[PDB]
Amino acid sequence: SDKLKEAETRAEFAERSVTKLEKSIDDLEDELYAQKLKYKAISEELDHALNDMTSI
C-alpha cells in the first residue's frame, strides 16, 4: 500500500506537469499564429508597394 501511494503521488505530479505544459503550449501557439498572420500581412504590403514601382 505504501508503494502504491508513492507511485500514485509521482503519477499525479507528472500529470499536472502534462496539463500545465499543454496550457503553455496553447498560449505560445496562439501568439505564434498571430505573429505569422501579421508577418504575412506586412510582407504582402511591401510587395504591393513594389507593384507600385511597377505602375510608376
Partner 1 sequence: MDAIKKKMQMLKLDKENALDRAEQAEADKKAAEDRSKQLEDELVSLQKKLKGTEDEL
User: Which residues sit at the interface with partner 1, rule CB under 8 A?
Assistant: 42, 45-46, 48-49, 52, 56
* Least Cβ distance, residue 38 to partner 1 (angstroms): 13
* Least Cβ distance, residue 26 to partner 1 (angstroms): 32
Task: Give the position of cell 505504501.
Answer: 2
C-alpha cell, 45: 504590403
Beta carbon nearer to partner 1, 4 or 37 = 37
**30 vs 36: CA distance, rounded Å:** 10
Beta carbon nearer to partner 1, 4 or 50 = 50
Work out the angle at residue 45's Cα, subtended by the Cα atoms of residues 43 and 46, and round it to the nearest 5 degrees: 65
